[PDB]
Structures are given as structure tokens and as C-alpha cells.
């Protein structure tokens, strides 16, 4: 048995308060049943996949993505309070649905999905596709590159958030 | 065991929804139990079909159709915001039913169904049938052609949407 | 294993709108437990039946009847919007209960049931019995003649609908 | 395994319900668990019965009784509208209970029960017992005679209905 | 296997109406778990009982008692409408709980319980104990004497009802 | 397997409840899981007990206690109406808890508990312990003595009730 | 098998009434899953425990603690009405959570937890740790010392209650 | 099978909550399924962990964390009242999430997470990571160090609380 968990990070000891508002609530990262299960997958063909047997998630993938996104956004938004729990009526909402989170026959690892943001009536939706390479052909390197690309797309979302005050 | 999933396309930097009218919600695409089952269907006679036991959907087919439809509509409606979740009050609703999504014994592939749309009170209903050809013997080519036909019908829905004031 | 599904049809590309109203909602085609199951049946005597073993429905019979009736009424009512989903408060309702959907010892295939329609307080109920013959003694021909007689009774209902503007 | 179902009779072109008063709803006919079970009962002594293990109802007996009652009442009440579903506000309600629906060791068949009806506030209650004779040794003849007695009691209910202003 | 059912009776063709009111609703005859089960019991000692193996109830004892009480009260109250279903707001209520329904080591068969009646605020409660003898030592005779004593206590309740207009 | 049940005593012609104040409702007597289990308990040491596997309650002990309490209270309160179901608005409530209902290794039997009563707003709380002696070796004698002690405590409750204005 | 139950006590025949108020409601004694189960435990190390196999609770530990606390508080608060059931709106509330209820490698038996009291807005919370010794190394003595220390902490709570009129 | 539980510390005579402002409620500490499982985790590589099958939590880890946090906060906030249950209206809320609570293959132990607090409308969010060293080979020492780090983080939360007016 081999279980993997996305390394969750933290933003030091900033202790951000809601005095300057800037609230953010993160809903559940919706994921289809071929990634939402406990099985790590590796694209072997154009539409054919392969579910791993003993290479599983430590906790379900959607919860991992939600918590790591909350951590990455809290790190990459200094002065913002981002939480996976409801904050208030003046909070801005974020809904993420992941479409791909696997490797590929060429040794590449793909992340992709869509994210929507509600800011006081203004809704902004955007899809994303990103790729990384494995230095060593292993599930360990696969999950690590997955986490790296997850951090990349979290940084993209943080930039898009900081763009509109 | 082999698993197949329809590739969910994605665009680049998308638009916002502060206009309100550029909103569309794709409710879950309903399919009958012979398509709702996790097995791939192969039409062998006029009313006879065969469900493959070792060739399955990676995730349930209805969720795949809903997600791929949302992605295609988000691509060919750049000024709009198409989502698989509710988006507002003046948001538009799109209810799609799929009656056939399988191949035939003559080496061909069929996709048929219906769809209803609500544009600010006006309800528009349209059925559709489409037929493609898989050129190489294999379920992978069948799934590829199926995804292509699904994208073609999403483009048809986009064209019908753009035909309104 | 041999699974059968009623061939669902379509009405081209009419794109009927609710501007001229003419809404129709189709409730679930209620069917007793000797036909509502997955087992095709063949009347062997006056009250004795025979449930088939490997001759089953692709999807449950009631859902098949509901969807095929929606399709047949959409085809046979040009200018009407017929759906298996609620349309509005000004919609007319239709409730169908099937009593027989099998073959007979003489090679005949029987369809029968009752249908009720609500049009703004005016309720119209009517029973129906119809028969067809099988050119070849086979379950394939049986299901095909069943679909043909289903289309026949759908045409009867469409005429009864078009009778009262 | 042999399955039996009561033949559901049907009339031709029936009437409408714009008058309101010509409305009747047959609630689900209740039978005890010795009749609610899917097995055919054979009364062997005064209080002793035997439930056939290989001779069963095609669908549960209570639903069959409700449907056959609705059909018979729709036949012998041409000016009325009898349905197994609610029909309006001024609609009439018919609650039927069946206490015996089986054959006896002397070669005879028994059908007994009670029924209550609500006519515009006036509640009318009447019990009934009827006995027929099966002439040929077989469960098929028993079911035939049972259906005939059920039709006779439906005719009795129709006569009691027609006796009101 | 030997199943027994309390013979339910009827009151001819009186067709009692609610014009003279006299409504009666019968609640579920509550019975403890040593009689409420499917097992006929036979008192072998002061507090020791014996549950029969193949001598069972055709339908659960409480439903049998409720239906037979409804029938006996409808027979023994000419001009009253007694039902196991709610009748109206002006109806009188009856609640019965049986404590014993078995035979005894001496060949005697005991029935006992308590019944409460609500008539427009006036509540009348009363316990009862009654005994019968078996002419032949058999479960058949046991159930038959049980039904006879049930009719006896039903007659007692009918007298107590007719006592207070 | 041997089953035991406490004999539920019964009186003759009882009284009515038009006075309102002569009303009492016995809520379900609660016992812990070592008494709530269907097995008879035998106290072997100070805190050690043994649950008989083949000597069981005919019906769950708590329901037996509630019914026997209602019967005894109906006997020793002739002017009152004690029931196991709600009786009105000015009705009185009696909540009894039983902590011990078993025999001891010295050949003796124990019954202990508490009870609360609501008399027109005044809440009265009283605990109780009682000890009897079984004279002949056998679980039957134990159950007999247990029922006797239960009747004694019901008489105590009756005496406390009669002590109020 | 060896089952143990905390000896519940009683306060004679005081028959305390609510005329002088002094109500007390006891909520469920919340207990973690290593003590809340049916398994008696014995601390073998600093953080290592040992769950007993055949040394179990007669009824679940939390119910036992709740009932014994109700009894001890009723004994040790003369003139108060303490119950495990709601008493009224003017009642004072008590919430207890136990953290330890086991023995130790040195033969010591530890009880510990926290209790909170609500008296008309004034909330008073307090933790407690207490120890006892076993004269004989046995589970019997263990449960007995547990009950003794439970009585001790009940006396402490009774003193804290009597401190504030 | 070996079970481990974090020792829940306890103080002496604590304070009251009549002031209202000295109130804190610790909602249930949430951990992912790799920590929510009853098994102890041992981090073997960067993203690889191993869950011990025979070394388990005595009770679920999340409940243990909540209880130990409440106890520590009750110790280092003498003037406050910290509870695991709601305490009032002006009460403060503390939502803690734990992302890591396990040891590493270099002989070290990690505890990381986040926590949010609501002080009279002001929401304060802070993450934390802490690392200890187990000196003797054994899961017992690991659990000891884990409890120590948890107490250290509770002290950090107490310090952040005391930093407010």
C-alpha cells in the first residue's frame, strides 16, 4: 500500500483580521468520479486511463484540493482571510471544478479545470490547463508535480483576485 | 478493465457576468439507464444492444456530458458565462436529455437527444440526431467520435443561442 | 443476455417556442410490477404470463414509455412544446397508465392502458386497447411491433389533443 | 414459476370531467398481509389456508384490484370519470378494503370486503360477500372466477353510485 | 406450515349514511411483542408461554383484530358507520390494547385487554377478561374460540356504545 | 427457549373521564440496556450480573412494565382513568424509571427505581427500593415475585396520588 | 462473560415537590469512544490503554453515569428535584463530560472530567481529577472503586450547588 | 492491538461566566481522512505515509483534539470559560483545522494546521506549524510528543486570545 497526500502549506503568523474585510470562502472542489475516488490515475492513451491499485490518496482528492487551495490562497493573498468555511454575508465566493489530475503516457502530468468567483453580483469564470514534467518516473514525483502545478494555478487565481480591488 | 472519459476542452481567459444577461446554467444531462450504467453500449440490431463489461466509463456518463457541454459552451460563447451550477436570477436554464450515445454494428456511431432552453421566459425546444463513423477497430476510436459529435451538438446549441436578440 | 430499448424519435429542427403557448407536460407512465420490471413478458394463457430470462429492457419500461411518448407527441404536434419536465403554470398535464405490453400465445402483441388529460380544469380520460402481429416469431419483432403500436396510440392522443383548441 | 394477473377491461371513447361532479378517485385497495403477499391463497379448512409457492401474482394483488376497479368503474359509469389518482376538489373518494380473495377446498371461490364512499360530504359505507364456482381443476380457472367476482362487485358499486341524485 | 386468519364478517347491505352522524373510528389494536408477532402462543404455566413454530397468523394479529373489530361493530351497531380509517372531525375515537390472546395448559383459551373511547371530550376506559373452552385440543379450535370470544367482547363494546346516545 | 411475561391484572366496569381531573398518562417506563435486553438478569456479586440466554422476556420488559403499571393504576384508582396514551390537556403525567428488576444470588429479588409525577403544575419526585424472596428454585418463581413487587410499587404510586387534594 | 453495572442509589421517601422550585436537569454524560463503548479499560502505560474482552458494562457507560449522577444528586441535595428529563423553563442545567474512568498499571483507579452548570444565565465550569486504590486486584474492585469516586465527585458537585442559593 | 489517547489535562477550581465576555466555544477540530481514520500515521517520504494497522487511536483523533484543546484553554485562560458546547449569544467561536499530526522517518514529529476565531464580530485567522523530536524508539513516545505539541499550540491560541482588549 502507498498513500499520498498533497503537502498543505501555511502563511507564517500574519494573523489577518476582518477589519479590512477581504473575505473569501472556498466551496468544495468538485471532481468527477474517475479522480474523486481514492485511486491515482495515469493517462495511457487519448481517452484511455489507468487507475492505480496500491497508489491511493491519503484523504479524498476533493478535500485535499480544497484545503491546499485555502492554504495557497491564504499564503498568496497577504491581508486576506480565506477559509473553507462560511465567513459572513459580505464574503466573496469561489467554486472550483477539476477535470484532470493525472500523468500521461509521455511522462507528463496534467492539471486542468474551471473556477468561478462571485464578488457582490459580479461573476467571473475561467478555465485552466497546465502541464508539468516528471524528473523521475514514479508516482511520488507524479504527486509532487501535481502539487506544484496546483500551487501554480493557485498563484494564477491569486493574481486574478488581486487584479480587481 | 479499461476506462474511458470524454476529453473536456478548455479556453483561455474568459469573460465576466456583471451584465447578468450573459448567464447560462446547464442542468445535469439526463440519460436512460442503458446509458446511465457505467458500461459502453454497442447497438447490434434494430432494438438489440450489447453493454461491454470490461470497457466502462471512467466516471458516470451523464456527469461527463454535463461537464463537456459546459466546457464547449464556455468556449463558443466567449461573451457568456456557462456553468453547471446556478448563477443568478435572470440566469438562463438549459435542460438536455440524451437518448442515444453509442455505436452501431455497421461501424458507425450515433448521438441523439433533445434540449430545452429558457431565455427570459421564452422556452425553446429542439431535438437532434447526429451520426459519425469510426475508422479504426477499437472502443477508443468510438469514444473519440462520440466526443466529437457531442462537441458538434454543443456548437449547434451555441448557434441557436446566438440567434436570439 | 439480450437487452431491448424502444427507438426514440425526433421532430427535425422545428425549434418550437412558447410564444403561442401550447405547453404539454408528461408525467411518469405508471406501469404495474409485471411490466415495470426489467423482464419482457409473453402471455401464454388467459391469465398466465411468462417472464423472459435473458430478454430484458435496456432501461426500465416506464421511463422508455415516457420518453418515447414525449418524442412522438413532439413529432405529431407541430407547434407544441411537449416535455417530460414541468414547463409552467399554464401547461396542460397528461397522465398515462399502461396495463398490457406483451405478446400472446397466438403470436399477437397487445398494448393497452388509460390516459387522462387536464386542460385548465377540463379533465378528459380515455382507455385504449390495440393489437399488432409479428411477421417473425422473435422477441426482436415483438419489441418492434410494441413500438409501432405505441406510435399508433401516440397518434391517437395527438389527434384527440388537436381536436380541442 | 407461474404468474397470474387479473385482466383489466377497457371501454371505447370515454367522457370528460368539465362538469366536476362526474369525478371519482379510487384510493389504493387495501388487503391484509395474507392477500398482500405475492402468493395465491387456498382456504383448506375453517381458519386454515395454504399459500401457493410457485403460483404467484404477476404484480401485487392490491395494485391489480385498484386498477381493475378503476377500469370497471370507468366502463359502467360512462358519464363519470373514475381514476386511481386525485382529480379535483369536488371529486369523490372511494376507499375499498378486501378481506378475502381466494378459493376454498370445496372447489369454490370467495371474495369479501367493505367499501366507503364520500359523495359531497355524505359518507356511505357498505360491506359485501360473493361466492363463485370454478369448474375445471386449475389455478387459472380460480383467477378467472376471482376476476369475474371482482367485476361483479365493481358493478354493485356502480349501481350504488347511480342511486344518488 | 399452518396459517390462521380470524374470520371477518359483514353486515349485509345496510348502506349506512352519515346523515344521522354516528361515526366511529378504530385505531390500531396495540398488542405486545409476544402476541404481535406471527407466532401463535399457548400458555404452559403461570408466566411461562410457548410460541408455536408452524402455527402462525395469516396476517399480523393487530391488523386482524382491528379489521374484525371494525366488522363486528358495523354488524352490532345498526345505523352506525364504523371504519378503521378517519371519518371526520365529529367522529368518536376508540383505542384498544390486547394483553392476552392464547390458550392455557388446562385447554382454556383466554382473551383480555383494555379499551378507551373518546366521545366529544368524554373519555371512558374499561378492561376486560374473557375465557372459552376448546371442544377439541387443536390450534384450529383455539383460533376459532379466540374469534368467538373476540365477537363476545365486540358485543360488550357495542352495548356500552349504545348505552350512551 | 423459555419466555416469561408479567401477568397484566384487570378490573371490572371502570369509570369515565368527563371530569378531566381524573386523568393520568403513564409514559413508557425506561430501563437500562441490561434490563432493556430481552434476557433475564441474575445478580451474582456486588456489581456482577448474569443474563440468561435461554430464559427471555416474552415481549420487551419496558413495555411490559408500562402496561402492568397502567393496569394496576386503573385498578387501585377506580375514580381515575390511567392510560398508556395521551388523554387530554389537564391530564397528569407519570414518568417512571426502573434501575433494577432482577434476582440475587442469595435467592432474593430486587426492584428499584424512581418516578416523577406532574399534578396540575406541581412536580413530585420519589425513589423506591423493594426486596422479595423467591421460595422455590426456578426462574418462574422469580418472575412471579418480580410481578408482585411491581404491583406493590404501583400501589405505592396510587397511595401517593390519593394523598393530594 | 462478566458484565458490570454502577450501583444506583436512592434518597428514601422524601417526595420533594417543585413548590420551592430548586429544579435540576442532567444532560447526557458525554464520554469519548474509548470509554463510551462496552469495554472496560485498564491503563497499562502513559498513553497506552488495554480494552477488556469479557469484562464489559451491563448498560452503556454514559447512561450509567447519567443515572447514577441523578441518583447521587437527588440523595445529596435534600429539597431539590434532580432528573435526567426536562423539568421546566425555570430549571438549571448541568453538562458533564468524563475523560477517564479506568484503572492504572500501579493498581490505582482514576476518574476525571469536566462539568458545566447554567443557572439563569450564570455559567460555572470546573474540571476534576480523582483517584482511588483497589484493595484486591480485580475488575470487581475496580468498578466498585469507580463508583465510590463517582459518588465523591457527585458530593463535590452537590456542595458547589448548595454554595450558591 | 494497541490503543493510544492524548492525556487530557485539568485544572483546579475554575471561574464562572456571568460576565458573558469570558466565553469561548471550541467547535469540533476537523482533520482529513488520513488523520480521521483510527490509525496512527508515519510519514516515510515527502508525500508517502504509512498507517499503522495495530497501533490505533483509543477514540477518534478529532474528538481527542477537541477535548484536549478545551482542557488546555480552560487551564491557560483562568478568567475565561472554554467549552466544547455552545455557551451563549456573545460567546466566541474557535474553528481549528489540523492538516498534519504524525511523525516522520527522521525520528521527528510534525503538527500543522490553521485556526479561526470570532471575537465580537472580528474574525482572526492564523496558521501554525510545529516540530518535535521523539527520543526513544516507540509509538508511545510519538504520541507523547504529539500531545506536547498540541498543548504548545493551545498555549499559542491562548496567547493570541489574551492579546485582545
Residue numbers in the entry:
A (entry chain A), B (entry chain B), C (entry chain A), D (entry chain B), E (entry chain A), F (entry chain B), ...: 23 to 187
Q: What is written in the article reporting this PDB entry?
A:
The E. coli Paraquat Inducible (Pqi) Pathway is a putative Gram-negative phospholipid transport system. The pathway comprises three components: an integral inner membrane protein (PqiA), a periplasmic spanning MCE family protein (PqiB) and an outer membrane lipoprotein (PqiC). PqiC is predicted to anchor within the periplasmic face of the OM and comprises an ABC auxiliary lipoprotein domain (formerly DUF330). Interactions between all complex components, including stoichiometry, remain uncharacterised; nevertheless, once assembled into their quaternary complex, the trio of Pqi proteins are anticipated to provide a continuous channel between the inner and outer membranes of diderms.
Initially, we overexpressed and purified a construct encoding the entire amino acid sequence of E. coli PqiC (residues 1–187) tagged with a hexa-histidine tag at the C-terminus, referred to as PqiC throughout. During purification, PqiC was observed to elute from size exclusion chromatography (SEC) at a volume similar to that of Aldolase (158 kDa) indicative of its assembly into a higher-order multimer. The structure, determined at a resolution of 3.2 Å, confirms E. coli PqiC as a mixed α/β protein with its two opposite faces comprising a three-stranded antiparallel β-sheet and two α-helices respectively. Two molecules of PqiC were observed within the asymmetric unit, arranged in a parallel fashion, with the β1-β2 loop, the β6 strand and α2 helix packing against the β7-β9 sheet and β3-β4 loop of the adjacent monomer resulting in a buried surface area of 15,309 Å2. PISA revealed the interface to be stabilised by 12 intermolecular hydrogen bonds and a single intermolecular salt bridge between D68 and K166. The β1-β2 loop region was by far the most poorly resolved, presumably due to its inherent flexibility, thus there was often insufficient density for the explicit positioning of side chains throughout this region. Finally, we were unable to model the extreme N-terminus (residues 16–22) of the mature lipoprotein, also presumably due to inherent structural heterogeneity. Strikingly, the arrangement of asymmetric units within the unit cell revealed eight copies of PqiC assembled into an octameric toroid structure, ~100 Å in diameter. We anticipate this arrangement to represent the PqiC biological assembly, which is consistent with its elution from size exclusion chromatography far earlier than one would expect for a monomeric species of ~20 kDa. Finally, the internal diameter of the pore formed by the octameric PqiC arrangement is ~40 Å and thus congruent with the width of the PqiB coiled-coil with which PqiC is anticipated to interact.
